[PDB]
Each structure stands twice: as C-alpha cells, then as structure tokens.
From a paper:
Anion exchanger 1 (AE1, band 3) is a major membrane protein of red blood cells and plays a key role in acid-base homeostasis, urine acidification, red blood cell shape regulation, and removal of carbon dioxide during respiration. AE1, a member of the solute carrier ion transport family 4 (SLC4), mediates the exchange of HCO3− with Cl− across plasma membranes. Mammalian erythrocyte AE1 is a ~100 kD integral transmembrane glycoprotein consisting of an N-terminal cytoplasmic domain (CD, residues 1 to 360 in human AE1) and a C-terminal trans-membrane domain (TMD, residues 361 to 911 in human AE1). Here we present the [name] structures of full-length bovine AE1 with its TMD captured in both IF and OF conformations.
The classes without CD and fully connected CD are both monomers in IF state. Particles from these two classes were combined and refined using a soft mask of the TM region. The final reconstruction of the IF state was resolved at 4.4 Å. The IF state features an elongated TM11, which incorporates residues from intracellular loop 5 (IL5) between TMs 10 and 11, and partially unfolded TM10. In contrast, the core domain shows a remarkable difference between the OF human and bovine AE1 on one hand and the IF bovine AE1 on the other hand. This difference comes from rigid rotation of the core domain ~20° with respect to the gate domain followed by diagonal downward displacement of the core with <5 Å along the z axis and small lateral motion in the XY plane. Further inspection of the IF structure of bovine AE1 TMD reveals that, due to the rotation and downward motion of the core domain, the ion coordination site becomes open to the cytoplasm and fully closed to the extracellular side, i.e., it is in the IF open state not previously observed in AE1. IL5 between TM10 and TM11, which assumes an antiparallel β-hairpin conformation in the OF state, loses this β-hairpin structure and part of it folds into the elongated α-helix of TM11 in the IF state. The concerted movement of TMs 10 and 11 and the β-hairpin to α-helix transition of IL5 opens a large cavity at the intracellular side and exposes residues R748 and E699 (analogous to residues R730 and E681 in human AE1) to the intracellular solution. At the extracellular side, the downward movement and rotation of TMs 1 and 3 occludes the large permeation cavity seen in the OF state and shields the binding pocket residues I546, F550, E699, and T745-S749 at the previously identified central ion binding site S1 of AE127 from the extracellular solution. The IF conformation is stabilized by several salt bridges between the residues of TMs 1, 3, 5, and 13 (D447-K557, K448-E553, E491-R869), which aid further in the occlusion of the OF cavity.
Author numbering:
A (entry chain A), B (entry chain B): 420 to 707, 720 to 747, 775 to 909
The structure:
Amino acid sequence: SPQVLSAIIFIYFAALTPAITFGGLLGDKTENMIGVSELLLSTALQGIIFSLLGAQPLLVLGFSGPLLVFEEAFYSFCQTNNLEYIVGRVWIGFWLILLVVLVVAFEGSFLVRFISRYTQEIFSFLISLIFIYETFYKLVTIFQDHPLQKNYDHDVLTTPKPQAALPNTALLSLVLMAGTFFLAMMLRKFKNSSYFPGKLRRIIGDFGVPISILIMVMVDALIQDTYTQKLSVPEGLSVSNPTERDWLIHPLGIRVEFPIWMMFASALPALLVFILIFLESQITTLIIFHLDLLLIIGMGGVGAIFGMPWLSATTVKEQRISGLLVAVLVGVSILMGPVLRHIPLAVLFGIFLYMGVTSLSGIQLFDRVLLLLKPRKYYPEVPYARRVKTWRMHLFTITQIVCLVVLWVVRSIKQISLALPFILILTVPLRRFLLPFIFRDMELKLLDADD
Amino acid sequence: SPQVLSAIIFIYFAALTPAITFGGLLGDKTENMIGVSELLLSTALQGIIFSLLGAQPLLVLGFSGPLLVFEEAFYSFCQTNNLEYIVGRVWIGFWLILLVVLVVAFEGSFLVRFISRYTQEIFSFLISLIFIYETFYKLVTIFQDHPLQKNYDHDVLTTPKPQAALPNTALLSLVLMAGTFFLAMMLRKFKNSSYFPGKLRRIIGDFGVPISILIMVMVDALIQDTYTQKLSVPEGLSVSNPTERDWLIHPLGIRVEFPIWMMFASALPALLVFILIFLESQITTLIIFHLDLLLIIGMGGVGAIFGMPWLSATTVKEQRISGLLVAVLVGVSILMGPVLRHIPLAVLFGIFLYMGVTSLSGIQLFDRVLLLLKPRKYYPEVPYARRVKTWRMHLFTITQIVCLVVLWVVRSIKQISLALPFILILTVPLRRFLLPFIFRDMELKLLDADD
C-alpha cells in the first residue's frame, strides 16, 4: 500500500540518522574499537528479534546518549588501569544475564512509581549539556593537532592518520560543523512555518536531519584536494581493525590475558547498565510489560558476546512487518561502505550538536531557568507561575542547579567516574524526603508534577 | 549635562559605523584611490559647515549605498576608456556647481510631489539586494586569489599584497565575515527581547553594530601568525598612496593629461549625482524647504575639489553643539591609525551584509513578496489584503519584479552603465500613466499609498 511505502522510508531515515553519528562518536571516544559497522549491525538483528517477541512491536530500539556517556566513562576508566575494553565489557554482559533471572522470577519495576519530573528533567538536561560540550572539546583537539601556521610541510602521508599538521583543516572543519547545524535549525523552523501548503511542506520538514547532511556531503565531495577526517568504515560484514578484534570474542583476551581479579568483580559496572536502560525505558512508554523490558535487558547482554554495544528504548496487524523491514534495511545498509566513507566526521558532530540543542528546548526546566534572568514583569502565564510566589520559584531552580553542578563535577574528574548513575539515582530520596520538608504539598504539585 | 554625555557618544558610534565600512568597500572597488582617511575626513568638516548653516541642524549627513553604487559604476566606466578616476570626477563636481545656481534662482523641488511608494520601495529594495550580492562576489575573488590546495609555497612576501596563494585565508575570511553578521543579528534580536530590565537592556542593544566588531577584532588580534587582508589607512592627515594623489588636485591631471573632449562632456555624470542625492534627501525629511538641500548639493560639489566623495542626507538651543561635537570627534578619529589598521576587511563586509539585511526587512514590499509564495490561508490581516482580490495582488508584485529585473540587467553589463538612475526615474511616469490604466483608483490607494 502507498501508506506503507512512505512510512517505511520515514522510519528508516528516523532510525538511521542517530546510529551513524553515534558510531562516529564512539570511533573517536575509543581508539577505533567500536564504530559504525558493528553498531549499525547491532540494531539490525535486534529489530527482528524484538519484533518477533514484544508487547509493543511498533516501538524502535535505538541508541541513546546516556548509554554512550556510560561507555565513554568505561573507556576512560579502562585506561587508568591496564584492561581490555572489549573483553572486560563482555563479562559485564554476562553479569547482566544473571540479573535477568532475578527479575524474571519476581518483578522489580517498583521504582517506576517513584520517578518524577525533578529526576528526568535534571538528567535529560545534563545530557543536552554533554552533547554541546562534547563538540566544543573537539575544536581544541583539532587546533592542537593542526595548529595555525604559515609554513607547514610538504607531502605528509595521511592514509591511516595525518602524521603532521597540514593546512585547510583546523578551521575548515569548523565551517563544516557549523554549517550542518545552521541548516538543520533553519529546516526545523521551516517545518513550523507557513511557506508552501500544509502537507507539501512537512513532508520535507519532517526529514530535516536526513536532508541536511547531503548538501554538505556534496561540499566535501566538491573539495577533494584538501584532506578532512572521515568515518572509519570497513568492508561489508567486517569488523573495523580486524587485527584487533574478531566477530567471536574470547573472554580470556585476544592479545593480553585479562586480569583474574576482574572476572567476578564486574558486577558494579553492570547494575549501572541495568539502571540506565531501566530509567530511559519508561520515558518512551508514557505516550499511551515486565517481559518487554526483560527481553531488552537480556538482548543487550547478548549484544556483549560478539562485541556490540547494547541498545535502549526510543520513540515510536501489520505491526510486525514494519519492524521486520526496518531491521532488514538497516542490516543491508552496511553494504554501501564505498559511498558511506565520504561523509566527514564534522558533519556528524554538527548533527550531534543539533540533537543536543533541540532536545534542550523541549525540557520544561529550561523555560524557567531563562525566567530566572527574565525581569519579573514579562513572565508567561502558565498555571504554575501565578499561584506560586516568585521568590520561591528561583529557590527550586537553585536546588536543581546545585545538583547539576555536583553531577557535572563527577563526570569531569577521570579517576572518580563510572558512578554518575549512582550519585544521580539517590536524588529520588532527595525528592521524596528532603523536598517535602521545605515546600508545601499544595505548592509542590505544580513544579514537578509529571503528566 | 549627563544627557548630552551619553547622546554624543551614541550619535558618534551611529555615524562612525557606516563610514569605515564604506571606506573599505571603496578601497576594494577602486585600486586604492578612495578609502577611509579621506572619506572619514570628508564628513569631518562637512558636519560643522552644515551645522553652522542649515534649516535642521539635528540631521546627520552620512554616506549612503546608492552613492557608492554610482561611484563604483563610474569607476567601471572609467576603465573601459583610459581616464583618470579622480581627475574626471573633479570636473563632475564643477558641473554640479552650475546646477546649484539654476535652482537657487528658481526652485525645482516639484518632483517631490510625484514620488510615491512604488518608486522608493523598488529602489531601496534593489539597494538591499546589491549589498547581499556584493559580499558573495568577494568569496569568488578570494577563492581564485587563494585557491584550496595542500602544497603551497614557503615565505611569500605580503607587505603590499600577497604575491601568491597562502593557506588559512580563503576560508578563514569566510568565518570572519559570517561571524560578525551572526552576532549582529543575535544582538538585534536581543534589543527586541525580554532579557534584563527595560533600559538596562536597550543601552547595549542599541549599540549592536559598534559592539559586534570588537569581539572579532580581538579574534584577529589573537591570531597573528596567519595573514588576513586589512584596511589601507595611511598616517594622520595623509592621503592613501600619496605618490598617486595629493590634497590639492590639478584638473589637467597628475600623471597623464586628461582628454580634452571630456572637459565639457561631463554634464551627464553630474545631473545623475544630483538626482540620486535629491531622491534620498526627502526620504529622511518625512519623520516630521530648498536652501537646506541646495547647500548639500553645493557642498558635495565642493567635496570634489580635493578628492572626497560627496555625502547625502541620513537619519537624525543645543542643536548646533551636537553637530559641532560629532564633526570634531570624527575629524580627530583619523589619528588612531596604528590601532585602526588591525580591523580586517571581512569584518567590515560582514557589517555591510548586516546593513543589507536589516534594511530589507523594513520594506513593506518584501512582506508581500513572501506572501506570493505563502498559501492563501495564512495571510496576515492588514487593511490592504482583505479589501483587494488575491489574484490581483500578485499581478502588482509581478509588475514590480519585471522592473527589478530590468534594473538589475543594466547594473550587470559593464559597457552600458551609469544609466541606472536614468532608467529608474522614468518609472515615475509608469506609475502615473500606465498604472492608472490597469488598476482602479479605489484599489490603488492601498498598495502604494505612502504615509
């Protein structure tokens, strides 16, 4: 049917846009171990093996920011002490497996009843802040790798990586990253404009991210005499750096024996995986049970066997075939390596920043963070700003900002890390115990009352 | 008084912002003959010698876009046949002088009664289109002067001008031009926002252009190892390229005798100067007369004696001292050459584009040019869109677009030029004779009825 023909490409683009950029981000946050080929394959089988078994086969299992934060933190920790990033993570997966049985025997979704706005708008807000900060850290690395000079050197080999500073890169990349973001923002506003009649508009506006990558892929295509960093994509059905990893992974290590005292001490880096996948797994279920989430947990654990990052829930009869088709198309997408390698990394990072910005404006916390600076004579009329004293509003925002700073500090120091979720989850008692001691109940039902 | 102390700096910045950028534009549109030192001095004496004698001493005599268009057209024509740009223009000034007497004897401001919206919104709209097109022509010249490569050469001398292509310029300039414009737009929106209380906001917002040049002057200051094109400013009270021109100009030429058959055939390039200065001289007088304009005409003619471009009217008791002070400060401003030469040209061109954009949104013609593309179900409610048939509105815009294209073609071809004003003024009969034959009087009083 014509409806399906359009819907399947719509969902295909919506699901393919984040995967490639996250694969590139992982390719840079690690040496080259985890990239696009395995990640794009990670969600390929996952689609079908969730569509076959699932309460809601209309959902999409994409890759989310918090998971990436956890893996980059793990890589940072994995380098403080000599450890194999791939191999150790594998054991984490096995630990997840034994957590599956303990919840299959008896449900453990009680915490869903204790999750509120104070928690999911301080956590998501932090994610929208790590995305913006992440792209500004790359400019520093670029300016140090290719510093601005006027002499340079002749004929530097660059096939594996630029061996020395060369011109037209430190600030060409800046143009490329700042161009995609600008075009994406303009098309986002286009979708919410009055140019062109109705549907004939939103057909293109709804494809802003998929469309605002090709313009400046062509830009790099038309500029070939200047080198730019691009994606690291191996051949079809192949693992990037096949001399460093294989499809089948040996738990005892590939090159160096994995330390003995790590086999059974990997429980801690696994319950946190479970917590992160759990918290995000209910935000996307409020659009409208236990087995649906337990399958996701076990299947993410399975993904740790051959070396694929685990997936997480995302946004949204013939229900089965939709997931079937999206999964098979994603799987076949990895055969376009020769044309997929022309995409430069700065374009992906610009799309990443665009993701980090749009997700920020939808959070209701920011709408009052700005009001803090706003003078108290232009406040918008919302039924939580006229029934509450003005000098009490700013106090709540300060209570949230202090927690935000506390969370940020932990994410900054390299030594003490991998505990951001542990320090974040204990904010729920702060909301359930400390907050009811300072604010009145009839006032608190308007600041952090989730709908 | 404190009021004066703030007002004088306010007007000083408002009058100094356009002069520097126009001087740079002239420095590039000519070899180096006319630049900033003489132009910034051109309006220095002019301020006092108009404040002393003038009907409204509160006005400001700045440099406008159409005049610059005329001078660049004259330079283009001056190169088709071997002629001295400075010397020939001098004679034009003398011609303007004899036009002064003919109008002093009897007034000639009749055409003011025949100027309407159809004329000053098709002319100003074009000006806002050259400004945008002008800055996009420079990128082509830059990419041809410094093409993108990866080998380049070592140690190129650049003191008078870059003798060969060097890195970090073809697209650094792009960052610099696109940065000032973005910041200026953001601060323009800042002035129309609700951040910060009332006046404490608009004090900075009203200085958007003066403030959004220093940030990225500092950017170039912090990047000194990469060369960028900058202003050509000579020492204090000196003419740029003093081996090519002097303060006192000899009408028979400096290096080559000026052709004889040009002395008395320069009337045509002078009546057009008069027409351009006339048409703009009434748009700024409708905010609420002959000698006031005749003085401007004669004084612009005087400016052609020592080699300064003529000035034109612009936007807006102690009235005298304001002009006195603004003039003396402008005159003294030319002593800051050592610090004024650090400003790069791309910054000035970005400010030029900003000027070309803001002036575009204020024209009521554009507000319906966009409606042409708008579907006929979101039209704004203005008392000229509900009393007129929709299919008749687009016709008027087409009648204006065809004239716009006709005007653009003339400005494009190099051979046939210097006649844009001649072909534009005869649009007034088109408005007074052709238009009343196709549209009804009771319908025409809502499309081009000036207030």
